[PDB]
Every structure is written in structure tokens, then in C-alpha cells.
Design a protein around this ligand. Structure first.
Ligand SMILES: Cc1cc2nc3c(=O)[nH]c(=O)nc-3n(C[C@H](O)[C@H](O)[C@H](O)COP(=O)(O)OP(=O)(O)OC[C@H]3O[C@@H](n4cnc5c(N)ncnc54)[C@H](O)[C@@H]3O)c2cc1C
Length: 194
């Protein structure tokens, strides 16, 4: 077996386990399942930058899709904004992830706002972006699970299933489900945030 093939079973077994982490996973999965009722798989993507937060999120998204929409032929979409020179270990992880989950990647380059705008013009049906955001400052503590982008931003629905997860929660989840993550976290990196 592999983690991707086994996601739907193992992820929902954890969510049904009653552990502290199980309750976090169940909460995330409820947000994602709600997302799947609101948005088609052409309308929905995961904001993916190779970090541990969106790695956990992608695994949750795949697991929910396998459970609620196994016959839908559409592939899972990720959105990646390239805002910095290539970092070889991170690029390899992105390519590896694309292969593992058979992803359709929507990519643009430049600043977040300009690149999101370009991506919107190229993919006008895209409505919603699953985000790995956690509650780490006053702004993120103010977010709802479904939070439209702020004024002055390309208009998307941000969906935030991990708001209540801790740093420890993210690592416990990835380790307990044997989910591959970017090798940079083994080489002294604590965050890949901007
Ligand atoms: C689609 C989208 C809409 C946004 N809308 C707003 C907004 O309305 N108001 C505002 O103040 N900020 C907005 N942001 C900015 C966002 O909140 C972060 O400040 C920014 O993405 C940098 O994230 P970080 O990795 O530094 O940290 P974090 O805030 O921890 O990142 C949160 C999540 O953003 C996603 N993400 C981050 N970097 C990328 C990337 N390069 N490509 C794709 N997804 C990425 C991932 O899902 C990540 O888990 C938006 C970002 C995205 C991608």
C-alpha cells in the first residue's frame, strides 16, 4: 500500500477515533466535505506551496474526494504561485506531489496579487481555494472557514479547514499517516512561510 491509495480509509479512521487529533481531522473533513457540496472539482483547488500545512491539507482533500466522489473523473487541482527563484528540493517535492496525487497544477509567476489575477483570467471557472492557514496572528484568528478574499484581491472564496490546528497537530497527522513532506524540513527548516 501507499498513503495516497489508503488515504480515504486511514484518514477517516483517525477522524472517527476520538483522539484529540481525530477531532481536529473530523473538523477539517467537515469543512472539506461542505466544500465539495458547494464547488465542483473544476471550481475548487488547493493552494499548494510545498509546505507542511498544505501537504496535510492536500492529503485531507484527496481523502474526502475519494470518500464522497470516487467516480468523478476530474483530477484534483492545486494552485501554485511561484514568487521566488527555484529551490531545487522544493521543486522536486512539488513534482513528486503532482505525480503521487495525479494533480492538475494551475501555476503563475510573480507577486501574489498579480499572479492570482493572471491565474483568474486563464481559469475563470475557478471559484474557491482551499488554504492551509492556521490561527497564528490576529488576522488569521478572525477568519471564518469560508472567507471571501479581501478588497483589492482577485476574488476567490478562501476555504480554511485547518484554522484550529497547532504546529504539533500538523506534524502528528503527517507522521501518523506516513504522508511524505518536503525534505527541507529534515534539513533545519521549521517553516517554508513567506
Ligand atoms: C488564493 C489566495 C488568496 C489570498 N487572499 C488573501 C486575502 O484576501 N487577503 C490577505 O491578506 N491575504 C491573502 N492571501 C495571502 C495569504 O494569506 C498569505 O499571506 C500568502 O499566501 C503567503 O502565505 P505563507 O506561506 O507566507 O503563510 P501562510 O499564511 O501560512 O499561508 C497560508 C496558505 O496559503 C497558501 N499559499 C501560500 N503560499 C502559496 C503559494 N505560493 N502558492 C499557493 N498557495 C500558497 C497555502 O495553502 C498556505 O497553507 C491569499 C493567498 C492566496 C494563495
Amino acid at each position: 500500500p501507499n498513503a495516497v491509495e489508503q488515504a480515504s480509509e486511514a484518514v477517516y479512521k483517525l477522524a472517527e477515533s476520538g483522539s484529540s487529533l481525530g477531532k481536529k481531522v473530523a473538523g477539517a473533513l467537515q469543512t472539506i466535505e461542505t466544500s465539495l457540496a458547494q464547488y465542483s472539482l473544476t471550481q475548487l483547488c488547493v493552494g499548494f506551496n510545498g509546505g507542511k500545512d498544505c501537504t496535510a491539507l492536500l492529503h485531507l482533500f484527496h481523502a474526502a474526494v475519494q470518500r464522497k466522489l470516487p467516480d468523478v473523473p476530474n483530477p484534483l487541482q492545486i494552485l501554485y504561485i511561484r514568487s521566488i527563484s527555484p529551490f531545487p528540493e522544493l521543486e522536486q517535492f512539488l513534482q513528486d506531489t503532482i505525480k503521487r496525487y495525479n494533480l492538475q497544477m494551475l501555476e503563475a509567476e510573480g507577486s501574489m496579487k498579480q499572479a492570482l489575477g493572471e491565474l483568474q483570467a486563464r481559469h475563470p471557472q475557478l471559484e474557491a481555494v482551499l488554504m492551509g492557514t492556521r490561527r497564528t496572528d490576529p488576522y488569521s484568528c478572525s477568519l471564518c472557514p469560508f472567507s471571501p478574499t479581501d478588497p483589492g484581491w482577485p476574488a476567490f472564496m478562501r476555504i480554511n479547514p485547518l484554522l484550529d490546528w497547532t504546529y504539533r497537530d500538523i506534524w502528528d497527522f503527517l507522521r501518523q499517516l506516513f504522508v511524505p513532506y518536503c525534505i527541507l524540513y529534515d534539513r533545519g527548516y521549521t517553516s517554508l512561510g513567506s
